Symmetry: C5
Subunit: 264 residues, 5 copies
């Protein structure tokens, strides 16, 4: 009665912790260590195995096969932890070349947020009207800008979209000579009470330095955004590995349960 | 004499450390590891158990049941540690969907600060006057703004409450044409000593860039505030788990004490 | 000859490391783990004890009592480590209510810097003149401001002391109409070369935003100062616990030494 | 059947983790610990060896030689981990004197990005035209500035290249007296509507302080860049050590496989 | 053949790692733990010793003395690690009073950079001319300012040297009334085109707030500089301890080698 419980509780707990390690968010600070830490908890347990199946007295290959399979599984998990952490730095050494895994990471992120399976993708409010049709705004295979949206598309084309209307307004809109809203129509005599349009050119340099420091801060902001994106990609890969290993763990448990009468 | 002490001191110390781990604040840096670290301290101790109850010589299911229960308890604690840490990042992968646990976290935070049990909620200075009544300022089921307070309500409606009087003063107050306090009454001839009301439009752009960098800093401030809120939620969940497991640990100790004569 | 040395060196080293852990500064990042790490170093050592005093072959309660006492001491130390770390975050959950331990922490900090024992408090340069007397500047039981000093009192009453002379100069000093030092005496005709006293009101808004960002930075400065104060309080509590446990460790060592002939 | 598997799976897993540790990016926070952590996982395993080859009962030098070789390999790896981490701080104590390893690190970084082996260096689009020739812009043995490029050469000569045309425009270009583009040709009567060219000298001091704080921020930016360069150098050295130890591990595995029939 | 190798390789590896731990830079984050981590690697190894020299079967004081010496050495190293880390925070509790170890740390830093031994101090380019003589600029026993240099002396006397010529130019230089270089000679009629010398006093307040935030940033810069100095001092003390323990380790190895025939 105590043998089965003492052999099942620790193994089941270790198998559950192995999955919980990946279920944890992308904590690059501790993950790389946590994945190994759990492994240590198994090594000590291996000693107890020597009591029930010594390496020179008892010959029980049945449970030894399952133990070796679990050891290989945890080793592969610890190894893939390093590959996952690799996506957090992207050192210049190379390896995981960019422009290849980004399309897969974006697809995974879109499938996690917007479910794709028939349970929620097909069974949902839909119609055959223009609300689900496609046009020049959807089919952008020719490198067309995205539609105007507040999720990072309206201000994107403006700020990040260099050479656009916000920075290069070459299209003749007629505001410089047709409208007077904050734009005098070819008014060359508009003087600031007898002075030029600018009180002191030093203000221009002050504004330039202010914009320079603002861009310096935006550089760190973009670095933090890239770090967050790398963390999200690592978490997505961890979730994928968890989903993949879930089936293997379930199969191993089913085999150990169905093969228990053969040994016990 | 030495057997009972040697079997009680380590188990009691481990049971106390298991609770102290949750009693620790929400230290995401070490908590995720600490919860596992303590577990290691038990694994080695398990070896000592093999001396008193070998897995193939002695059959003592009485204490084995309690040992397995303690192992399952610590495993569940380590597993819930990961669920708690999950509330610290809220990755885009999903899982703990927001807008559901926030109402429970706020309720727990309000109950911890403002006690709700009869010991302090009912036995306190109270009266049947307007000080405890309700009005349009308390019953805000129609999405009404909170009362004016300095705890994050007076400046909230002003700054975060867009489209309000601070940004969209559409209500005709009469200050633009009835009062002269920092608001000339339709005075179109008010010139800055012969110059327009503004010395140089470049100052407007300088102020705009200053406000832009101020908003950039406020973004990081809000990120830090959200991180602190997530840490507080994790600490609240840890305290809840501690309170829940306290009864289980007390019951286990009472059972081990009352069942000691059966084994010893 | 080897038995006594092998039993004394590890125990003495562990007892010294237990105290050195608290002697370490308030390193919240590693302390919480360090206190537990040392504990692990003892668990393995316990295995060696099983060789000299098996749990079912040898009955030696003499040294077993001291071993259990040391185990309880290290467990209490590890437990108090969590209480110490609790003073580093002060989560909204409650527990260590403020306004109670602050007066004790300040007293401990003043006693550590300014020694209070007769060895250095009484034996020091002193006299019965006004240098050691008290007046309205020392007896501030009526919530009086502290004396003017550069240790955080001169600028404190100025900046942090709202409603004072620096922000609300209600006392009629006579500088607005009696002195002309940076204060024209009721000079309403003082114009900036024909212009108002201010060139552009936009400069006022620029200065206001500059002061706003300065206050935003001062907020983080105050947060860091509070964190440093919490770290100092944790270090003070650690030093107090070290001083308390020093006597217990000395008594345990004296007992083990005087009781050695009984066992050895 | 179980003996060979139980002796091969753990050893192979440890050998793979030893290489994966170096395959991990330059994580100075955990690397220094990770390299040692894996070592611990071997120590416990050594205990199991005592079951198959006790230190006083069985004499099997064949596998003992391979075990000692693996132990020495992991020890050398752990030792070189410290030398790698040394490149992350470069303390004033000395040791790894600069100006010597920089030329090797740059060469390694250029070889990793731009492959040098014949597989990709020689087999690639090339021609005997000027596209592959050399001139005064390529042969810069006389300390000549690099060609103008956007990879850190166009703005480098401008900002970091003190005493240049951007800061010391001594070459007579003729813009001060030949061109009027933002440079009045010796126009001494150009007044800002009756005022000097500058409205207020205080703006000059404001711009000077703005540039001072910008340089203060650039100092931290350069510190972060140097830290990133040190991390990249550490990662390059780790990859080099990995490539070096790969051949040794392969040779050890081949020897253990070919020498298995002698022992088994 | 296997006994000697199995007893020498682990001990030698541990002795080398003990020194490599100190050879590592002053990593306060991991050092405090690393020093203890290595210790754990020894505890497990101690178990193996019980196989060759049980605590109740074999009496071998020869190697037991060396084992106890190594244990005491590693314990003293771990203890001194805490004293080294103490120099990283300098808590208000006291202990290592400043103004005493600073002169020793500076001397050690100067001896490490500028070698003092005859191998490099005496054997170097030197002469008996004024290049090696002393004058009022070298003998500064009367608290004289250091010579003008770019290593932190030219700008030091200017910025940090309050009450100097940069802030208190009391010496009558004659520039206020003798030179017109950015200093009108008692020109009271110099008006900014009919306006006072300053366009708007608000610019003075803006510059004052800019300087205030610059000083706030300089405060954090000085804090980081002090932290770096403390880290350098800790690294210097670690190197000193390494050099001290090198002789002890060499003596222990020589003794173990010369005393091997007595035991083996």
């Amino acid at each position: 009665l105590y043998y089965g419980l003492n052999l099942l509780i620790p193994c089941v707990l270790i198998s559950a912790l192995a999955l919980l390690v990946f279920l944890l968010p992308a904590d690059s600070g501790e993950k790389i260590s946590l994945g190994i830490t759990v492994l240590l908890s198994l090594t000590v347990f291996m000693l107890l195995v020597a009591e029930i199946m010594p390496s020179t007295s008892d010959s029980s290959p049945s449970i030894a096969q399952y133990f070796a399979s679990t050891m290989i599984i945890v080793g592969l998990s610890v190894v893939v932890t390093v590959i996952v952490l690799q996506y957090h730095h992207h050192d210049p050494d190379g390896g995981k070349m960019p422009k290849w895994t980004r399309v897969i990471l974006l697809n995974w992120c879109a499938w996690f947020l917007r479910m794709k399976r028939p349970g929620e993708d097909k069974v949902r409010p839909a119609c055959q009207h223009k609300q689900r049709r496609c046009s020049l705004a959807s089919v952008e295979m020719s490198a067309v800008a995205p539609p105007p949206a507040s999720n990072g598309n309206l201000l994107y084309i403006g700020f990040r979209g260099l050479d656009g209307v916000h920075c290069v307004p070459t299209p003749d809109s007629g505001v410089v000579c047709g409208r007077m809203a904050c734009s005098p129509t070819h008014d060359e005599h508009l003087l600031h009470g007898g002075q030029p349009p600018e009180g002191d050119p030093d203000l221009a340099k002050i504004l330039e330095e202010v914009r320079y420091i603002a861009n310096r801060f935006r550089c760190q902001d973009e670095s933090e955004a890239v770090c967050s994106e790398w963390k999200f990609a690592a978490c997505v890969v961890d979730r994928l590995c968890l989903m993949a290993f879930s089936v293997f763990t379930i199969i191993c448990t089913i085999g150990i349960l169905m093969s228990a009468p053969n040994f016990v």
